[PDB]
Design an enzyme around this catalytic site. Structure first.
Site, mmCIF file in Angstrom:
data_model
loop_
_atom_site.group_PDB
_atom_site.id
_atom_site.type_symbol
_atom_site.label_atom_id
_atom_site.label_comp_id
_atom_site.label_asym_id
_atom_site.label_seq_id
_atom_site.Cartn_x
_atom_site.Cartn_y
_atom_site.Cartn_z
ATOM 1 N N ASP A 35 0.839 -1.195 -0.073
ATOM 2 C CA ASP A 35 -0.074 -0.052 -0.092
ATOM 3 C C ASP A 35 0.843 1.408 0.027
ATOM 4 O OD1 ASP A 35 -2.270 1.786 0.077
ATOM 5 O OD2 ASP A 35 -2.066 1.885 2.282
ATOM 6 N N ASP A 220 -1.123 5.505 -5.646
ATOM 7 C CA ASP A 220 -1.354 4.806 -4.541
ATOM 8 C C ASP A 220 -1.696 3.193 -5.023
ATOM 9 O OD1 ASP A 220 -2.519 3.586 -2.599
ATOM 10 O OD2 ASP A 220 -4.204 4.757 -2.351
HETATM 11 C C1 929 Z 1 -3.572 6.585 6.857
HETATM 12 C C2 929 Z 1 -3.671 7.532 5.706
HETATM 13 C C3 929 Z 1 -1.928 7.849 4.964
HETATM 14 C C4 929 Z 1 -4.874 7.298 4.906
HETATM 15 N N1 929 Z 1 -4.455 6.665 3.629
HETATM 16 C C5 929 Z 1 -5.327 6.650 2.673
HETATM 17 O O1 929 Z 1 -6.746 6.815 3.042
HETATM 18 C C6 929 Z 1 -5.109 6.037 1.251
HETATM 19 C C7 929 Z 1 -5.659 7.187 0.216
HETATM 20 C C8 929 Z 1 -6.414 5.016 0.643
HETATM 21 C C9 929 Z 1 -5.380 3.605 1.121
HETATM 22 O O2 929 Z 1 -4.556 3.450 -0.080
HETATM 23 C C10 929 Z 1 -6.353 2.348 1.282
HETATM 24 C C11 929 Z 1 -5.514 1.518 1.794
HETATM 25 O O3 929 Z 1 -6.093 0.327 1.093
HETATM 26 C C12 929 Z 1 -6.655 -0.509 2.109
HETATM 27 C C13 929 Z 1 -8.022 -0.841 2.209
HETATM 28 C C14 929 Z 1 -8.717 -1.528 1.629
HETATM 29 C C15 929 Z 1 -10.406 -1.874 1.848
HETATM 30 F F1 929 Z 1 -10.875 -2.651 1.309
HETATM 31 C C16 929 Z 1 -10.712 -0.888 2.525
HETATM 32 C C17 929 Z 1 -10.048 0.378 3.300
HETATM 33 F F2 929 Z 1 -10.690 1.037 3.929
HETATM 34 C C18 929 Z 1 -8.700 0.452 2.971
HETATM 35 N N2 929 Z 1 -7.047 2.059 0.221
HETATM 36 C C19 929 Z 1 -8.349 2.607 0.074
HETATM 37 O O4 929 Z 1 -9.017 3.363 0.865
HETATM 38 C C20 929 Z 1 -9.316 2.063 -1.105
HETATM 39 C C21 929 Z 1 -9.248 0.749 -1.355
HETATM 40 C C22 929 Z 1 -10.028 0.201 -2.666
HETATM 41 C C23 929 Z 1 -9.783 -0.982 -2.867
HETATM 42 O O5 929 Z 1 -10.622 -1.572 -3.425
HETATM 43 N N3 929 Z 1 -8.813 -1.654 -2.516
HETATM 44 C C24 929 Z 1 -8.249 -3.145 -2.604
HETATM 45 C C25 929 Z 1 -7.687 -3.592 -1.762
HETATM 46 C C26 929 Z 1 -7.584 -2.981 -4.246
HETATM 47 C C27 929 Z 1 -8.192 -3.511 -5.382
HETATM 48 C C28 929 Z 1 -7.353 -3.707 -6.537
HETATM 49 C C29 929 Z 1 -6.293 -2.966 -6.553
HETATM 50 C C30 929 Z 1 -5.686 -2.375 -5.441
HETATM 51 C C31 929 Z 1 -6.333 -2.336 -4.243
HETATM 52 C C32 929 Z 1 -10.807 1.003 -3.073
HETATM 53 C C33 929 Z 1 -10.713 2.503 -2.860
HETATM 54 N N4 929 Z 1 -11.473 3.357 -3.738
HETATM 55 C C34 929 Z 1 -11.910 4.667 -3.140
HETATM 56 S S1 929 Z 1 -11.971 3.118 -4.991
HETATM 57 C C35 929 Z 1 -13.603 2.367 -5.125
HETATM 58 O O6 929 Z 1 -10.892 2.267 -5.928
HETATM 59 O O7 929 Z 1 -12.406 4.276 -5.622
HETATM 60 C C36 929 Z 1 -10.195 2.867 -1.960
HETATM 61 C C37 929 Z 1 -5.644 8.412 4.575
HETATM 62 O O8 929 Z 1 -5.093 9.337 3.949
HETATM 63 N N5 929 Z 1 -6.792 8.540 5.281
HETATM 64 C C38 929 Z 1 -7.555 10.051 4.932
HETATM 65 C C39 929 Z 1 -8.953 9.607 5.405
HETATM 66 C C40 929 Z 1 -9.089 9.866 6.947
HETATM 67 C C41 929 Z 1 -10.416 9.847 7.433
HETATM 68 C C42 929 Z 1 -11.536 9.130 6.564
HETATM 69 C C43 929 Z 1 -11.218 9.157 5.086
HETATM 70 C C44 929 Z 1 -9.969 9.179 4.779
#
Ligand code: 929
EC number: 3.4.23.46
Length: 373
Positions: A35, A220
């Site tokens: 990730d 990402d």
């Molecule tokens: C700690 C910090 C760095 C954190 N980082 C992130 O949020 C980044 C941008 C997102 C991550 O890459 C985070 C880490 O991935 C783990 C994950 C898998 C899940 F099923 C569910 C989850 F909740 C998480 N990924 C996602 O949030 C994410 C995963 C997926 C998703 O389907 N991921 C799977 C595992 C995947 C599939 C195929 C290829 C790669 C990955 C989809 C999405 N979308 C929104 S979408 C539909 O594609 O538009 C998002 C962040 O920035 N948070 C901000 C925040 C705070 C409060 C509320 C919301 C956001």
């Protein structure tokens, strides 16, 4: 050695790319989602219906409690847990053991994915976005400080169930073609980059380039889609909509809410545009482009029909160049030199007459204007 790391990623299609790791003494084997959008290394430490194994702190003779709690939210789900350090290594990775921070996950909400086959997450982005604060050393930093593994990694994600490579500590030239083009990492928190122009089938989208990075553009591997700010998302959808108006789509398809299908083998790839992202280059007034095919943003969803979900989606947290963007490309996270490089990968996806491409150089005046502050 590099060949030993080639093909060390796996995954079920739509469910993430994971690498194999061990934590503890003796070593417990777990699959870890790779990730680049986060910075916390975390594994299941407690029974969960979607999980087939988990980290057991009491079976490890090298576990050290840190008596501090943690919580990490993502766009799409969250978990909290208990911090601690333990010994860690990567079987199909560099031949070392390091002591790293591990978050032992004890509860979670929409985070684990049913049947994905991973039990944990490796956040490879920088300390500044680590939880609870930047003092929790991320895995990769620990890896570099405690060994001689150079400060660099590369991801070849292959879609086309799902496979790939994470080369830790260099570049394997036998995995991409043509040359690597580099874009500065603008700031070491996420892998933040600056997109300076967007074209759809050769037509400039003609928005103010501040909009492409409102309020940041990140690279990402943890997010499936290409996620765009509201304004940019609407201009894009309106174009893709009009290029494929020849055909019939319920408009919840455009929202990622339902599928479209075709008698197998007849998908009309030709009416879906190619999209070009132009990234800031490394020299004054210079950029380059990466071009993705519709096969990258229409993802096959598992009848003798071919069904596809629309995998470009809105966001209020800036641009996310997720696996849709990255699956065309060999992506180099040159931390040492603060840059990200792209080349067409060896496992590129196949149109009959169109090619995913990385091309330059280009002139682009005023590239600094493109960053949002
Ligand atoms: C700690 C910090 C760095 C954190 N980082 C992130 O949020 C980044 C941008 C997102 C991550 O890459 C985070 C880490 O991935 C783990 C994950 C898998 C899940 F099923 C569910 C989850 F909740 C998480 N990924 C996602 O949030 C994410 C995963 C997926 C998703 O389907 N991921 C799977 C595992 C995947 C599939 C195929 C290829 C790669 C990955 C989809 C999405 N979308 C929104 S979408 C539909 O594609 O538009 C998002 C962040 O920035 N948070 C901000 C925040 C705070 C409060 C509320 C919301 C956001």
């Amino acid at each position: 050695s590099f060949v030993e790391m080639v093909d060390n990623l796996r995954g079920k299609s739509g469910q993430g790319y994971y690498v194999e790791m061990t934590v503890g003494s003796p070593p417990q084997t777990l699959n870890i989602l790779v990730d680049t959008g986060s910075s916390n290394f975390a594994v299941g430490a407690a029974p969960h219906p979607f999980l087939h194994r988990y980290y057991q702190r009491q079976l490890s003779s090298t576990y050290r409690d840190l008596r501090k709690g943690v919580y990490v939210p993502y766009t799409q789900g969250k978990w909290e847990g208990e911090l601690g350090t333990d010994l860690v290594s990567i079987p199909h990775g560099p031949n070392v053991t390091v002591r790293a921070n591990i978050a032992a996950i004890t509860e979670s909400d929409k985070f684990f994915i049913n049947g994905s086959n991973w039990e944990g997450i490796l956040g490879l982005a920088y300390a500044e976005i680590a939880r609870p604060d930047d003092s929790l050393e991320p895995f990769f930093d620990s890896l570099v400080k405690q060994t001689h593994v150079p400060n660099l990694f590369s991801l070849q994600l292959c879609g086309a169930s799902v496979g790939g490579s994470m080369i830790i500590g260099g570049i394997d030239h036998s995995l991409y073609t043509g040359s690597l083009w580099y874009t500065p990492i603008r700031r070491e928190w996420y892998y933040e980059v600056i997109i300076v122009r967007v074209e759809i089938n050769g037509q400039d989208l003609k928005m103010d380039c501040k909009e492409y990075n409102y309020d940041k553009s990140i690279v990402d591997s943890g997010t499936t889609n290409l996620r765009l700010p509201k304004k940019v998302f609407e201009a894009a959808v309106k174009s893709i909509k009009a290029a494929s108006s020849t055909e019939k789509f319920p408009d919840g398809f455009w929202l990622g809410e339902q599928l479209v299908c075709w008698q197998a083998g007849t998908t009309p790839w030709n009416i879906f545009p190619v999209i070009s992202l132009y990234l800031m280059g490394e020299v004054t007034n210079q950029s380059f482009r990466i071009t993705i095919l519709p096969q990258q943003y229409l993802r096959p969803v598992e009848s003798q029909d071919d069904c596809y979900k629309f995998a470009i989606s809105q966001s209020s947290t800036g641009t996310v160049m997720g696996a849709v963007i990255m699956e065309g490309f060999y992506v180099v996270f040159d931390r040492a030199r603060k840059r990200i490089g792209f080349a067409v990968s060896a496992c590129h996806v196949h149109d009959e007459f169109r090619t995913a491409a990385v091309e330059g150089p280009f002139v682009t005046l005023d590239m600094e204007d493109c960053g949002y502050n």
